[PDB]
């Protein structure tokens, strides 16, 4: 069990959607360190004569919580000896240094886009649904999607683009208005009211389109580094038993990433509710 | 509390609120205390040739009380001490003068278009609801929006621009007529039915566009500051707080912007009512 | 009486009603001395190898209408004495030449609809409704508006222009036809109706919309006149004995305009009535 | 009694009546005193290796009628004295020859296109409605208008041109269709039907479309010279007493016209039903 | 009595009906009256370590059919005596060959389009509708016309051209269509559902949408004059012979046409039915 | 009964349409039986200054099917004696190789896209559509057609064209989009949204189109092999009766062309709702 | 002659009428439609070194009343014929306009000072009767005249000149008493209390002297309308008595002016009372 030589390559199933995950979130400006904060609150009070009204404005909301990339894998442990012996599995791990790094890049944006993904904690849509009642309950319609865009507009803002899941994109494109097109019906993605939609692969989102405005994407950069020591799930091949093993044999490259997502005031959400 | 070495940042909202205050209201400039407005009506003569019938009416309108801009409080006082010590906070104090100037029009629009803190006797919606009930009850529709414009135009007038809210912006986009697909909100130009309409973004207005013809903007400018003594004083952790608290040293920045608005006694409104 | 300063004079409202009055109801500015005449001829015969019988017609038309003039009188009584002392009241009567012109144009255009002073041959709409039925009680419809235009087109000649009030203009824009291409509304063009529509603000019409074939308008009259009262509506100033008679006046400015309205053969009529 | 100086007829209805009276309604006009039209019916019979029998016969129909425009009575009698004295009335009588020429077309169309105007040697829609019916009377609708074209195809198998009536255009425009085309005419389109035809003035027919395809209106019509003796109607009063009609001195212009209409059993007529 | 007289017969609208039969069929001319075959094709599907099993064989259909063109009877009896004395009636019988050819095409088309026309064995419209429900029963609709083509597509056959009638053209135009464009009878291309449709004169049944795929055109030729012996349709006393023998009279003018048509079960003709 | 030689060949306008069915689906050809496998996402870490997660996906995919062109005997029994004696039926069996190839393309597509056979079985497009439940309930409408194309583009890559069944193509031709453009129809090439829709002759597919772009199509080659010794009996008789097929010359040739198809869950299809 | 005049002469004692014009002066001259507001005293107190406490006040004047000068009665009618015929009397009427200008100033000053026949509310004697009486009169005395100025000084007001009638001037200057004080007379003008004062020609009582402090002068000019209309209001006797109707003949000129005197808080006035 676990240890066979065979040619394997991953293509356009998850890696294609991974590269555009944070770009769909619209990461306006990438900061060096997690210290980006908004200060303006805007204060004024109108009187008439012989009166002095006071005004105060001071705010700071910085986002800094690094999320690591994938370490040495249990499946790659059986393939590590195949990497040393054959050229096929070595090129597979070298392609993984970009493919699985993109998967770590995908899950980092998914932490903000979905509440179930916990890494950044208190960022984008994950913080939006809990703090503000922006999510519309029920079936996503052409009028309901514009009503979802109203929730993003309610906090003195405007929605840029709506992030769509693999199953949520079908339900959004199915709905069409009484007279207006709404569902595009040509080649382009179906718009909620006017703004274009971008696809983002998610595990939590199934029905309804969530829209994000201004939430920054800033990172140290998801890389790859070859190492000998990594503690995870135990793996054994022949004449060996592993219980507290980490440093003994090299399985896969311990990739390093330090990513952060800037928190927004209000971002739109949509979900199907049944009782 | 400390309050030292901080970077002040402004979000893209103050620039939009300041420009739309008088532009949506169509406030004509007048260099006088209060306001003066005129209205005239002439009479016609009979069919038979002998003598011509005279008597012609002349009516005048005036507005009172110009709302003054609010001075800086304890929040800006903590930053002004940092402005004297640090180079970065010194430019922030001058930027605070410009931000409050934008907020001065924001309070003027709240007093002008809405009845949130009425400084003038005719406050668009307050002038409508008290004198002539032209407001349409119920949900906003494309047929109902033109009918709302019909309510203002019936009393010898014409609808120029409908003041849009944050929730009303996307509510107009959702609205569509039985035959006509026109709504105008997602596009660069937004109109109620045909004639151009600008968004006001007010705390008092909840849902529904409110049309208005002519108004006034007088003697308005920007904040004048040098050295000011506070009267009431907001509660703060930094520096001493007292009942008769004022500062001789640089802490508070004074403001000077007085403006008054006149009503034509014919303006439309829209609001949702529960069945 | 009070008195008070005139300050300023309005022009904005009267300017729109003055220009559109003569062009309304398909107006023709054709020069006529005293009265204009129109004639029509008809013949009918069929037969062979026998005596022939023929017929001939000669029609006569008359249009005799007098000038519309208005003095300063009881209406501008507080401004008549104020003309000698204040600069605003003196310039008011000179500017009233264009304001009373709007009133002189107001009665001439209203005579086509109905009006109190019927200078013309009855009324261009009332005599047309008595000759041919076109008006329907209830509510004006978009399909019915095309039928109303066809109602004038059926008798004698095809209709070109449809006259409408300010309240009717907003009501016609609210109305939409069964086909998308058929309905024009407020969104497309200045005119709501399909055919050429002219705005005429009058108390006699008040939401009706009636069409006309072809009617002529001939106007000639200078606005320069000054005399010591003739009509006398109400007493002025109150300081001397005896009040009522038109004898002895301090200041009065009269403006005359002699205009004759020529009757059309066939026109349309439409009015709304509550059930 | 007493008529001088003033002359010239405007002729608003006579100008358009001459164009589409017989020219639009009928296909071709081939000049003859008694024109004859022919039609052949082909025979066909199929069988298995036997003799083929089938009688084919050609049926011909002749049309001969002379409808001349007569010299005018009563009206021209007062005008003849004015023609001899004044140059204006003499030129008016020569222009009346061209006006009566249009009236001769009006009398020809009344008994040629319309049902029973002068009843000039039968034919017209009157012959079609009595012998073969083909009218299908009812309410004027979009389905009923197509049924009029279908009635011509059911009896003779020939497509018919649009109606030449202005009073029927009012009933035609009021009709609404499920399709976007609607078919209304007058507002933008020349004709509601498939083919294009101009509306003509009707004296006998009140309401309903007069659609006819293949027809013949052969004519030899021209204005004739005025003679000394004529008797038709009322005699004119002057210095010498006269009661019996003979003219003697006064002259009225006649016309020599021979117009005939040919039938083809393909004409549409609509009539309103009320019980 | 039937008196012989010199008269030229008109070609009328019947001359265009000749080309309709072959154009609606859209089939190649076969060298002789025989048989046309079509393959059934297709074999059993995929399988490893298994038997192949049998496949379908080609099936031939009957293409040869008996037909006859009728000769002129007692209808051309008065014309035969006029042919001997005058050159006009003699040239009329030679020109009647083209008229008889139109009748010869009319009999062939009547079998393919209708059940009332009896000539060909196994009617194209009648037998196909009886064997399988392809023809629409009830009200004529634009959506129902596509449904008739869909019934033909169920048997793996695409409709090339729709068989149009003069009565059916007005019925198809009156039917409401979901599309904003709308074809309506004929404009330039004339389409029933999508592809181009040809008009055909049909006295039998009529007033219903018909569609056709591929029907055979066959060799026959035109008229062959002999002027001897006849079956005799009308008996008469002096104009025609009582006994069917014709003796030596040249009223016969024999015609030769033995054509045929064979088509697959795809063509269907809709018919109106009363509830 | 009766196995007589006819010496007649039947082909074209049936075999040509079936050949373009399976190849138009667009898939990469593979040398041996076995599909290309792709790994599905590697797991990621969430925390900083910790061990990190380690998991990688293993790729798995397979496609194995051996297709064959069937040897005919059920219909080739009479044709076997005709092939051995006459050159026409012998050349017909060689031309039947192109007919069997059409069946080989038909069986490859019908098992996948329509699930008529179980050749693909596991990797069948219709079976995958049932497993995914992406099918739209109801009639094939313009709104449903755009939703069907979007259903594939949401889950995976956007499909090129929706696979038609000719009968479904005609029903979809009746439906047209909201914008001024007809969907598919019969202009030049039928298209669902982008690329040209491939019509496939199917027994299972009748109404509703399935959209698949990334579906594999691979074959061993073309079907051509020798004929020797009888197998699988359906019908065999001429002079002596037989129960089981053995001995003598073969009726039609069994031909080898092993084809297999792999799927990636893209097809959706549409089913009509019945109550 | 009664009405007829040959030689016209200028009016005697012209300097006395001009002296009354200059007498109506105490508190400047300002031209307006009504009365202009004059600000209060506003005093300030020294108090101490550090604390700065004072007072500021503003007073307002009510805007009312304007001047008028009317046409002369009876005597003007005699002068009307003389002015029209002779150039010398016409120049005398223009010189009479300057004499009536002196009378216009005389009327406004006299009615304000005595009898209260002015339109102006609160002036000299009318101001004393409404607010507070300063001096009581019975017998003319030197001590009583000094007490009148002391009564005005008690309400904080300094008098510059005491205007009085010609009958009261001699009584105030010279009085039989024990000791005489303050008279002047020989220097420039006779004094009542101890200041130089001008006497005005007015219809006033001989017993009782009046004193003025501050009263505003206002004017709009003199002699505006020269040509007179119909005379009816004035009582005429010369040449022809006018009561009802009168032709266009100028008798006397109409003069236009506007006067309003500012109401003083303290003004001295004395009125005679019986014992």
């Amino acid at each position: 069990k676990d240890g066979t030589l065979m040619n394997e390559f991953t293509t356009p199933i998850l890696q294609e959607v991974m590269e555009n995950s944070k770009i769909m979130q619209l990461g306006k400006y990438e900061p060096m360190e997690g210290t980006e904060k908004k200060f303006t609150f805007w204060a004024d009070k109108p009187g008439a004569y012989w009166v002095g009204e006071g005004q105060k404005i001071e705010t700071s909301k910085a986002t800094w919580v690094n999320a690591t990339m994938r370490a040495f894998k249990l499946g790659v442990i059986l393939p590590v000896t195949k990497e040393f012996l054959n050229y096929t599995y070595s090129q597979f791990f070298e392609e993984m240094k970009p493919m699985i790094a993109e998967a770590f890049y995908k899950k980092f944006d998914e932490a903000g886009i979905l509440n179930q993904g916990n890494n950044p904690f208190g960022k984008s849509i994950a913080q939006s649904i809990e703090k503000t009642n922006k999510v519309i309950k029920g079936d996503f319609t052409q009028d309901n999607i514009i009503d979802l865009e109203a929730l993003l507009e309610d906090d003195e803002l405007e929605a840029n683009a709506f992030i769509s899941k693999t199953q949520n994109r079908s339900l959004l494109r199915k709905i069409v208005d009484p007279e207006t097109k709404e569902r595009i019906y040509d080649r382009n993605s179906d718009s909620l009211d006017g703004l274009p939609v971008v696809n983002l692969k998610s595990s939590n989102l199934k029905r309804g389109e969530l829209i994000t405005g201004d939430f920054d994407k800033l990172i140290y950069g998801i890389p790859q580094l070859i190492e000998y020591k990594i503690d995870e799930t135990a793996q054994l091949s022949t004449v060996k038993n592993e219980d507290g093993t980490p440093v003994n044999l090299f399985e896969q490259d311990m990739v390093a990433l330090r990513a952060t997502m800037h928190v927004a005031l209000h971002i739109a959400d949509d979900k199907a509710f049944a009782k």
Side-chain angles (χ1 to χ4, degrees), chain A residues 3 12 27 31 34 43 46-48 52 54 62 67 71 75 79 98 101 103 105 111-112 117 120 122 126 138 150 159 161 178 194 196 208 213 221 223 234 244 246 256 259 264 268 272 274:
Chain A
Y105 187 84

